Amino acid sequence: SEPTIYLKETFDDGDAWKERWVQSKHKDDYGEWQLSHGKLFADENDMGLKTMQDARFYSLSRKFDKVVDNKDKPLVIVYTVKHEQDIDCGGGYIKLMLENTDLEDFNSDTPYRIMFGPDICGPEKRAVHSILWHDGKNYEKRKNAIAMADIFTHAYKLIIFPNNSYEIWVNNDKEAYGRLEDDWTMTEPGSGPVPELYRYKGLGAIGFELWQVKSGTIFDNILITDDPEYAKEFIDKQLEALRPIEKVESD
C-alpha cells in the first residue's frame, strides 16, 4: 500500500524549518540551533540541525505532518545522529509526544510517550534510550541497546509491531528485538496479554530535549512511517553519498 509518512524532516528546504520547529520559552538560556552540513559532507547543500553552545539545555519541538494511530499497523521511527565534535557528555535522543502538546513550553518535565536515541557521558555510559509508555508512566527498557560514540553518522531506528513486538536498529545492524512485555517492565512479570501495549494513538510531536556539554551534534533524516521497507530505503538513499566519504575517514 502506499506508505504513511507521519513526519519527514531533512532540513533541506532553506529557512523553512524555522516555521515548523518551535524553540521552547520555558527557560531563558536554552541552547541555540543552526543548520550545518558538517565537517565531512558530500553536498555542501545537505544540512542538518546543529547544537551551537556548550553547557546548555536544548528544547526544540515540532508537530507531525499527520497524527499517528498505529492500531494494526507497524510504527517506524528513524533518524540520524552525528557527534562530529567528539562528544564527551550529551544527549542525542528525541522525545515523541501527544499531538496537543504546548511546544512553546516543551521541557524535561513535559509529558512524553517515547524517549529514544543515544546518550553518551564518558566511555561507560553508551546507551540507546528506548523508553516507552504504558498506563500513565514511562518505562526504561531492561537492557538498553549500545550507542555509537565515534564522530560519524549513525541511523537509529525503532520499530513497534501490532503483535506487541519491536526491533531496534543502529544502521543496518539489528541490536535488539523481542516482545514488549518481556524486554521492559511495563507489565506484571508473569506472562500475560496486554493487547494494546504497542499502541501510540494520538502521537503527533517530536522534540529535542537535551543537555550537552561539548556541543556540535548534527541531527538529520527524521522519518516516522508505517512502512519498515520505505524506512530502510529512505535512509539508504539519504546517506548514499555520505557513507563512503565517512568510511574513507574512518580507515
Helices assigned H by DSSP within the chain? 17-20, 180-183, 228-238, 242-250
CB of 41 to Ca ion, least distance (A): 10
CB of 180 to Ca ion, least distance (A): 32
Match 536554552 to its residue by C-alpha cell.
30
Choosing from 220, 226, 227, 246, the residue that interacts with Ca ion (CB under 5 A) is 220
Helix or strand run (H / E) with residue 7: strand 5-9
- How distant, in Å, are the alpha carbons of 62, 79, 116, 135 from that of 20? 6, 17, 21, 30
Half-sphere exposure (CA, 13 Å, Cβ side) for 57? 15
Longest dimension (CA), the chain: 54
CB of 23 to Ca ion, least distance (A): 20
Half-sphere exposure (CA, 13 Å, Cβ side) for 110? 31
- Confirm or reject binding of residue 107 to Ca ion (CB under 5 A): no
CB of 86 to Ca ion, least distance (A): 21
How many residues of this chain bind Ca ion (CB under 5 A)? 5
13 with 39: CB under 8 angstroms?
no
Site track 24-53 with Ca ion (rule: CB under 5 A), x = hit: ----------------------x-------
**97 annotated among ligand-binding-site residues:** no
Tell me which stretch binds Ca ion (CB under 5 A): 2-10, 74-82, 110-118, 141-149. 2-10
CA end-to-end distance (rounded Å), the chain? 41
CB of 216 to Ca ion, least distance (A): 16
Tell me which stretch binds Ca ion (CB under 5 A): 36-44, 157-165, 173-181, 219-227. 219-227
CB of 37 to Ca ion, least distance (A): 8
**226 annotated among ligand-binding-site residues:** no
- Confirm or reject binding of residue 9 to Ca ion (CB under 5 A): no
**10 annotated among ligand-binding-site residues:** yes
- Pairing status of strand 21-23 against strand 56-63: antiparallel
Choosing from 12, 65, 140, 167, the residue that interacts with Ca ion (CB under 5 A) is 12
- Confirm or reject binding of residue 171 to Ca ion (CB under 5 A): no
Nearby residues of 52 by Cβ (< 8 Å), 6 or more positions away: 31, 32, 33, 34, 215, 216
Q: Which residues are annotated as a binding site?
A: 10, 12, 46-47, 220
Residues in touch with Ca ion (CB under 5 A):
10-12, 46, 220
Q: Which residues are annotated as a binding site for Ca(2+)?
A: 10, 12, 46-47, 220
